[PDB]
Amino acid sequence: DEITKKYIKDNIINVDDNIIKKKDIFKLKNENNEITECAFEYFESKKKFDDDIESRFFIINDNNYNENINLIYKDIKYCGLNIQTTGLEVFDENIRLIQIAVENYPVIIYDMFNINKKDILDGLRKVLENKNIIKIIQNGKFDAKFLLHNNFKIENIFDTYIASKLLDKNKNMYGFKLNNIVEKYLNVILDKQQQNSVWNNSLLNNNQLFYAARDSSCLLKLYKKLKEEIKKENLHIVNDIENKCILPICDMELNGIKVDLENLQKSTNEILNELNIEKDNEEIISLRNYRRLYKLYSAFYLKLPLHINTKTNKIHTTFNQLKTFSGRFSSEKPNLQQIPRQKNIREIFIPNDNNIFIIADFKQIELKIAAEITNDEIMLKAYNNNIDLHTLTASIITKKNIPDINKEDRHIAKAINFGLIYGMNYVNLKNYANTYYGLNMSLDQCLYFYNSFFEHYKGIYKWHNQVKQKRALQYSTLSNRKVIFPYFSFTKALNYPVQGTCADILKLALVDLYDNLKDINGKIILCVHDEIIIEVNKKFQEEALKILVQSMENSASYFLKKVKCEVSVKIAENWGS
Template sequence: MMYFTEKSLILVDGSSYLYRAYHACPRLTTDSGFPTGAMYGMLNMLRSLLLKYQHSHVAVVFDAPGKTFRDALFIEYKSHRPIMPYELQIQLEPLQEIIKSLGLPLLVIPGVEADDVIGTLALEAEKLGQTVLISTDDKDMAQLVSQNINIINSIDNRMMGPQEVFEKYGIPSSLIIDLLALVGDTSDNIPGVAGVGKKSAQALLQGLGGIQVIYKNLDKVASLPFRGSKNIALKLEKNKGMAFLSYELATIKTDVQLSLTSNQLTYTTPTLSYLLELLKKYEFNQWLSHLENKTWWRWHCKAWHIIEKRIIIEKEREDKKGAINTFEPTTYLDILDKVTFSTWIENIKNSKYCAFYIETDSLDVFTANIVGLSFSTMLGKAVYLPVSFSKKTSSTQLDGFYILEMLQPVLENMNLVKIGCNLKFYYKILKKYNINLQGLCFDVFLESYVLDSIGNCRDLYILAERWLHYDLAMLTHIVRKKRHKPVCHPVLIGSNNYCAAIHADVTLQLHTKMWTQLEQKRDLKYIFEEIDMPLVPVLSRIEQNGVLIDKKFLSEYSKEISSRLTNLELQAHEFAGESFNLFSPKQLQVILFKKHGIKSTKKTPGGDLSTSEEVLSQLSLHYPLAKVILEHRCLSKIQSSYTNKLLRMIHPDTQRVHTSYHQTVTVTGRLSSSNPNLQNIPVRNNEGRRVRKAFVAPQGYSIIVADYSQIELRIMAHFSQDAGLLLAFSKEQDVHCATAAEVFGVDLPVVTKEQRRSAKAINFGLIYGMSAFGLARQLCIGVGEAKIYIDRYFGRYPGVLHYMRNTRKKAAEQGYVSTLHGRRLYLPDINARNGIRRQAAERAAINAPMQGTAADIMKLAMISIDIWLAQQKFPLFRMIMQVHDELVFEVKSHSIAGASMQICALMEGCIHLDVPLRVDIGIGENWDQAH
C-alpha cells in the first residue's frame, strides 16, 4: 500500500458521494421542509475522509449536466438510469456552494464525466511525483490504480492498490478495461460480449491477455482450460464490434483539457461569512458548532498536526467560563492502588447515581472478559480501572478479582441508580463473575430510542454528535479504535484513562441531556420507565436461557439438503440444455430470456431482466426450469441461513443457541434478534417448519408456544371503535369468516376456506395500508374486483375507514403517530412532494400504531411473566424465545396444564382493551410441533 506524504492528492468522486449520501440520509429536512439529507451526508463523508489521510492537494469532482462524448458513441449509454430525483436536484447547487465556501477546489467540466477529470488529474499528479488517493465506489476507477495511485472505496473504506485489485478481480489493473469490455457494466449500460461472464473473462485475460491479443488469437480460445471455451470463441467472434465499442466506452479519458493543473488543487481561504449563512439556512447545527469553536481549521491542517491542534483547542475551551460539553483529560483518573480505590468506592457509595462503562475483549458474552471499567458520578469527571485476571498482573495494576469483589456491593446496590449504554450486555457479562447487577435505571441507547426511534440509537459516537454536538469522530485521531479495544495516542495522554473514561463521562452527559426531554413528555417517560427499561434484565435472562438444539437432526437435515441441491442442479442443467451457475443471475437471464425466449415480467433497478423470487414464482406455473431454480434457492437459503449457521452457533457447554435481542433496531418498538435471527425462520413452508423441529425441549420437559391471536386486528378494533369489529371480537367470532361473509355476500356458516383466506388478506392488508392494486396482486384478481372488496369492507367497517383517514390527517399535521401507550413513530416523509415516499409514510402511519402497540403489549406480558417467575420458589417454566406475536417456554411435562393457565392469564391480563385479548396455546416436544 502506498505511503501518503505532504504532496499527496485526494480526488473525490462527488457524483458517487452524492447518490450514496442521498440514499443513506433521505429523510433529513429543514423546518420548512427543504430536503438536506444528501448535503448533510456528503459533507460528513468529505470531512471524515480529509481528516483521515495526510494530503496537501485535493479536489471534489462532479459530473456536469448534459451529454458526453460516450452518448455519441453509444445511444444506449446509461439510458436505463432514472432521472435525478427532484429532492436531490435541488440540493446540488447549495451543496456545491458550501463545498466552495469551505475552501475546497470543486470541478464540474462539461462534455466529460467526473471519471475522466479524475483520471486526467491522477495521471498528471503521478508524473509530478505525487501520490494520489481516489475516493469512489465506481469499479471502473480500478483501471487507474498503480503503485502511486490508490482507490478507497467510499462504501466500506477499503483501500485498493495493485495487489488488492489483483486479489479482487484476478487480473492486474492494466486489464480492467478489457474485463469491462468482455463482461460489460450494467450500471453504465455497457453491453460487453453476450454470454461471457466474469469467470470466463478472467480465464481469457489470464490465458491470453487483453482483447487486442484475444482477437488476434481466437483460434487459441477453444483450447483454454475452462468450461465452455469453444462456445466462448464463437461468441467473441460474433460480438467483436460490441467488444471494442465496450472497450472504448469503459476507458477513462486521461487527456481532458483543463484550465488548471493538479499542482493548483490546494485549499483556499474559507469564505466564513457566506459559509455561516449557508449553514444557518440549511440548519446544519453541528457544523455551526465547529465554526463557533473555531474548529473549521481541520479542513486545512495536515493529519500529523491534528493532535497538537486538538490540545490547543482544549486549552482554549478550558479558558471559557461556563463552558459546557467539553472534554478535560486532566479530570480523568486511573485507579491503580488500593488506597485510591477504597477512597473512590466510599465516594460512589455516597452518590445517588453512577454512570459506568465496561470494556471487554469481545462482544460474545460467553467468551468475553472484562478488561476495564470506567465510572462517572459528576459531569466532566471519571475514573478508569484497568482489569486483569492474570497471575502476572503488574505491580502498578490492581488484581481483577479484587476489583470485582470490592465492586460487587456497589453494583448490586439497587438503591444506587446505574446509568449505562447497552446495559443488557453489562448485566450478562457481570453474571459471569457472579455479580447480579441491580439498579438498572437508565440506558442512554434506550433513552434516545424512545425519544426518536429513527436513526442509529446504538452508537455512542452518533448519540454524542446528535445530542451533545460533540465531535467524537476527532477521537479517531487520538484513540485509534480497533474492533473492540481502543488504544490511546500517547502524545496526548499517555495512558488508557482518557480513552475508557470518556465513555462513562459521555454516557452521563447524554443521560442528563435526554432525561430532561423525557421528563417533559409524560407518555414517552412512561414508555421508558414502565416498558423498555424493565425489559432489559428480562431479555438478558431469556438470552442466557437459550433454546436446546437437536444437533443430530439438524446435521442430517443439512446433509439431505446438500443431496437435494445436487439433484436440483442436474435437473436445471437438463431443462436448460447446458451447464450453468444456478447462483448467477446473469447466466440465468441468458438461459431463461434469451435461449428459451421466455418473456420477463419485471426489470431490476439497473435495467436487467429480473430473476427475482417474485418473477420465478410467476414463471414456475408454466416453466419447469423456473420451478427448479426457485426450489434450489429456497433450499440453499435454508441451508446457509439456518441449518449450517445454527450448527455453528450451538454453544459447546449448553448445546443451546443463545440469540441476542435488540430493543433499538426497528422503528415501531418490535424486538429484533440476531446470531441467530429467530424472526425470519419460515413457518409457512415445510422446509422452515423442519428447521423449527430442531428446537427441542430437554428430557422431561415440553415446549409451550403462547401466541396472541389476531392481536393487531384487536388493536384496530380498540383504536377505531368500529361497532362491527367490536361486536365480532366480543362474541369471539372468527373475524376473517365474518369479513368474508360481508365481502362475498354469503351466510357465515357457508364461508369457504378460500373466501376466508381472501378475507384474511383484506383484514391484514388494509391495516398495513394496502391499495387495491396490492390486494389484486396478492389475491390474483383484477384491480376492479379488489376495489369492490375494499369498498364492501369499509361499508361493513366504516369506523376503520374513519380511523385511517383521521390517522393520515393527524400524522401530516404533527409529523408522527403514537401507540396506545404513547410511543412515537416520526414520519419525515409524511408531507414529501415525492408521491411514492409520501404514500409509504401514510401506510406506515396507519400500521405503526397497531404494530407498535402489539410490541408494547408483548413487552408488558414478558415483564409480568418474569416478575411472576421471580416470585416462585420452584418455577413451573421459563421463557426461552420471543418471536413475532408469540412467546416460547420450556415447561416441566407434569406441569403443562398449570403452566398453560398461568401463561394465558398473565399474557391476556397485562393490559385492558375494549376487546378481549386471546392467547392460543400449543404444546409439543419441539417448536414446530407446538406451533
C-alpha cells in the same frame, strides 16, 4: 525506564508522562451520621483538559484498598456504570475494569485482574443490586451481559443509547456514539484519541484510563439532560419498557437455544439429496423446486452450523430492539425471524434434559389493536362476543350466517381483511388475493368486497379518511413511540401504529415475564413475530403455562382497554408441533 516504572505497584504503565498520584483529603458525610472526612489516593492528569469533565480517579487493587471509599456510595441515587472487557464475546472473555462515577467525586475503577479479595467487591455488588440506584450506561446490553454472566445481579438501568435513539424519532441511521451524543446534548467535543486498546495485558495504559474515566463522568450530566428531553417529549413509558427490557434480552442471548444435530444433519443430507435430484432433473417443477431446496439448503441448513456453539450445541444469536423501524425485535447471526415457518425444520430446535418448551402466540393481535385504535363498534363488539373477524367479514360479504359459513369464505375474508385494513384499492386487492390466496376473483367482485367492507366498517373508513386527508409525517403509538416519515406513505402510515403497539406489548410482556418467571427459575429463549418461547423444568409445566398466559394478558390488558387478546399456548418438546 524509571518514569515508566513509576506506578507499577498500581499496575499502570506511564507512557506519556502525564499521570500524577495525589493523596488528599475528601469531604464525606457517612460513617454513622456525622460528617466524616477521609484521605484517599487518587490519580490526576498533568495536562489540563479543555472543557469541564471529571478525569480524577481511584484505582482498586487487592493490594491498595480503603474501606472508606465504599462510604461514597452511601446515599447516592444514580451513578455512571462503565466497564472495560478483554473482548466482545462474553463466553470467551473476561472483565478487566469496572467503573462507577459518583456526583462531584472522582471516578472509581475496580481492577478485576489484580483484585483477589471478595470483601472489596461487596460495595460494587451492593450498588449494582440496589434496585433504587440508577445505573447509567452506554450500550448497557453489552456490559449487562458480561456482568450477569460473571455473576453480578444488576438492576435499575438507564441507557443513554436508548434515550438518544428514541429522541431521534427514528429519522437517522448513524450518529449514536458516545462522542456524538455528548457532542450533541452536552456540546462538548471529547478528545477521543482512542486507539485499539488492549485490556488483555496486566499493565493499564495512562491515557486510556483517563478517557475511559471521562466516558463515565459524562454519563451523569448526559443522563440529566437526556432525562429532561425524555420527560419533555413524553417518552417515559417507552424508556421504562425498553430499559427494563434490557435484562430480558440479555437472558435470551445468554440462555440461547439447543439444537439437535441428528435431525439437523439428517435433514441436511436428505434435502441435499433431493437437491441433487432436482439438479439432475416442466418449468415450475425445476425452477421452484430447485431454488426452494437451494434456499433451504445453502441459505439455511448450510448456514446454521456456523452459529452452533460446537460443544453446547446451542445457538446464541444477538437481539436488537431499536434497529427496527416498526419497533419490533430483530435478531442477527443468525436471524431467527428469517428461519422458515415449517414443522420439519423448526423440529430440530429442542430444550435441555430436565427442561421443556412452552410456546405462546398472540392470536389476531394485529387486527385487535387496529380494532381498538380505530374504535370500530362492529369489530369491538364482534371481538367482545368472541367472534373471529374473518368469520364476521365472511358473513358480511356472503351475507350468510355463522352456521352456513364455510372455510373458503373465511379464506376470502382473510384476503379481504388483511388486504383492505392496511389500505389498498380493489385492483391491488385482486392482485393480492390472486397472488397470496390464488383466487380468480373478478374485479367487479373485489369492488363489491371493497364497498361492502368499508360501508360496514365505518370506523376503519373514518380512520383511513383521517390519515389520508391530514397526510401527517409524525406518528405515535399506545406507548407513545414517535416516528417521523421522510414522505407521506399511506400504507406505512396506517401500519406503523399497529406494528408499534404490537412491539410494545411484546416487550412489556417480556419484562413482566422476566420478573415473574424467576421463582421457578424459568428461562426466556425466543421472541419472533407474535410468539414467545420459554424453557422451564418439566416440574413447573402447568405453572409456567399459567405464568406466561397471565403475563402476556396483563401486557395486552395494559395497553388495550376494550379488547381481550387470545393467547394460544402450547407446551412442547419442540419448536414445531
